[PDB]
Amino acid sequence: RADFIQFGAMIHGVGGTTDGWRHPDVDPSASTNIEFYMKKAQTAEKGLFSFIFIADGLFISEKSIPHFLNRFEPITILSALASVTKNIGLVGTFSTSFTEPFTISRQLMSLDHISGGRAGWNLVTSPQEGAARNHSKSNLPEHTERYEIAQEHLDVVRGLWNSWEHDAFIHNKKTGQFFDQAKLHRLNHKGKYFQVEGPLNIGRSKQGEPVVFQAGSSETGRQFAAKNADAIFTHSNSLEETKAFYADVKSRAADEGRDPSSVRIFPGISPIVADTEEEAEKKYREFAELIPIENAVTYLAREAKARNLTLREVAQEMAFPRTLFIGTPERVASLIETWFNAEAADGFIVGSDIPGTLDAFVEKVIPILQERGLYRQDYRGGTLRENLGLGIP
Amino acid sequence: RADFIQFGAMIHGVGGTTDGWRHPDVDPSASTNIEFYMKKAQTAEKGLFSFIFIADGLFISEKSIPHFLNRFEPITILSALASVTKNIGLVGTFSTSFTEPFTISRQLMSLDHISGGRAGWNLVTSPQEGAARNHSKSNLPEHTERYEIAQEHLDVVRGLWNSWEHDAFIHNKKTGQFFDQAKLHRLNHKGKYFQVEGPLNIGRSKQGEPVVFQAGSSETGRQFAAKNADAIFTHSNSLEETKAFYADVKSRAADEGRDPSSVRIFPGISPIVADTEEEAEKKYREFAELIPIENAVTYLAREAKARNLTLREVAQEMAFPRTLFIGTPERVASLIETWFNAEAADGFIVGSDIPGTLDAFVEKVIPILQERGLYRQDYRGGTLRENLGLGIP
């Protein structure tokens, strides 16, 4: 593989699970704790991760997971992290369903300027029906319309980001000419979902414009991403389903005129790395055991895994399934390597809900990849595009 | 006066003027320059300013002032500054006319958590008619409706901020009870302008909720501010008009049940402080002279000031009127003191467009006020409410 592998670090505060917070190692306030977020981001930056990633949602109930009940908004925390990090990209989830594209176009570009070219947007059409009810609507649009809207939203957002050319801001104190009037472009969009005259009140960043990520996994979703995205997040249920998605998407991107190396595909994994197989397994177990089994049985009570498993352990493994990427550094490194060479992945988003994981990944797994020529020895540069391998538009 | 005087620092990048950027001392890129913003904020924090202030607008044309053409968005830059500052409040201008209150309620509270209780919102109904056309509307609502909407917006925003009680987040790892279900309040707003079910997905901050500022100067505006605001910005055309406004507003606040010391009134000044009267005056002049007089005459060509002024100097003084707060430290200190004792001001927002001003104010003027018992010797605490003198709701 000509290219290197890449990593992004998802920072999800107190984690993606109903009871993982109960572990002794976990700060149950992590989700609103600036320190937690800073240390993580600096660890990822130490491991030369290309970006940190913040996921997001806009609706809760009292049965939502603890993280979702009380956490940072994405652009605030990324902007804060911007000032205490040097090269790592800053990618954040924003819905096309609720915000005005001007508002968002601005906040992302502003981030991009603050950070000297490290912004990314995880564009998300947004699934929670109750979200509508937090934003003065009755209901979400139906799924297909959702993606129609997103196309228009993005197109406006990208239009605005091109309000100014890279060299518009001339700043001639002698002539009193601040900017070149020819290099300023009014969008004048009057579309179906949005009307936006422009121009945007901030110009081009050291990487041009932020990088687009996209999560979408449906037929519609893959097409959209294949068409519009610089990078795609996907799941990692298995090597083969992930090889499939990769194939399909890189194909559809060719069908849209695009060079497929221009689209980077990033499945999400949460490695549990330890010095021995039995330590890693301990850790898995401490966490899997945190759920009250009473809960766990029920959600089970709506595969063949008679592997000497008791009902309890099967109820537990449902609550908190075990990653393939468990165990020794070389095992984890090796899977990661195999997935890459198989063309299931161009890189991975690393979750690190369990305490120590992110730190252990960076410390033990990265050096191996570096040492086998699979991962760089230092940051390519200071923008998210340089580091990702993408060209400035 | 029982209370001390207070200051906020407006940071306006390359300034509020058409040609001030042309001065040799001015970085014409200041408006998108994170370094500029950081140094300013740290200077203000060194002078124990209660807050920094970022103004904002959402519409431009090619005849807009250079700052407005290309600058940071407010919540991004405040969030960035949050991580490099320790006690100074972080106040930002946000319109009620375009954003959804959930979006904003979140971003402000998130800021509040990041900063450990230093957020403020300058609530602004927003005047630029073309702004509507950047946010998929034909036109602004008429002025009165504008303030009806703002009342609902704010009320929702404050409702959401009360989604959780200060002690809701119990975090009992032993009992598996993350939060107290009784302490979680669904807003369920179905108003005229907005419908918002809630609850907000982030809870109470170390100062409860952010502080409300408000600029409004009309009959409607004063009433609104008097009713809703923790602090009010106003102009400083003259001592007497500012005494009037102060009077009127503190009065109307009594008419709304409120203790008027609970409302803090902050006129905006841009002092030009120097070691001698003639140096300060030089500086004024270098800047006033930057405008091409050709421009300057015209805007004149639609007072009695035969003060040996040539037409040129009158055209110039229109372009860039001279502050009362020009000259020596003790003069500036003394005016500031007189305005305070006259009850025109409880504090001031300090603009510092001219290079050195903010630095000179902090260095030369503050010590005098400190030394005459008018200004504290250190920060009262770490929240914007402590420092302002306000109680947590």
Ligand SMILES: Cc1cc2nc3c(=O)[nH]c(=O)nc-3n(C[C@H](O)[C@H](O)[C@H](O)COP(=O)(O)O)c2cc1C
């Ligand atoms: C790494 C990764 C991150 C995701 N982050 C979010 C998120 O932040 N917010 C959200 O609403 N959905 C998120 N999703 C879920 C997607 O919305 C989902 O996988 C899928 O694409 C559903 O959309 P579709 O029906 O259009 O394809 C994420 C998915 C992946 C795999």
Ligand SMILES: Cc1cc2nc3c(=O)[nH]c(=O)nc-3n(C[C@H](O)[C@H](O)[C@H](O)COP(=O)(O)O)c2cc1C
């Ligand atoms: C210190 C100060 C800051 C202001 N900042 C803004 C601003 O950031 N954005 C804006 O649109 N108007 C701003 N204004 C202008 C107000 O909108 C204006 O003074 C006035 O209240 C007009 O509103 P009204 O007709 O409702 O009273 C500011 C005013 C003052 C005095």
Ligand SMILES: OC[C@H]1O[C@H](O)[C@H](O)[C@@H](O)[C@@H]1O
């Ligand atoms: O809040 C709900 C959402 O937010 C999270 O951040 C998740 O990653 C996403 O899959 C979920 O839909």
Ligand SMILES: OC[C@H]1O[C@H](O)[C@H](O)[C@@H](O)[C@@H]1O
């Ligand atoms: O952008 C236009 C607006 O933005 C500025 O930040 C100003 O303070 C405000 O008075 C003006 O209305």
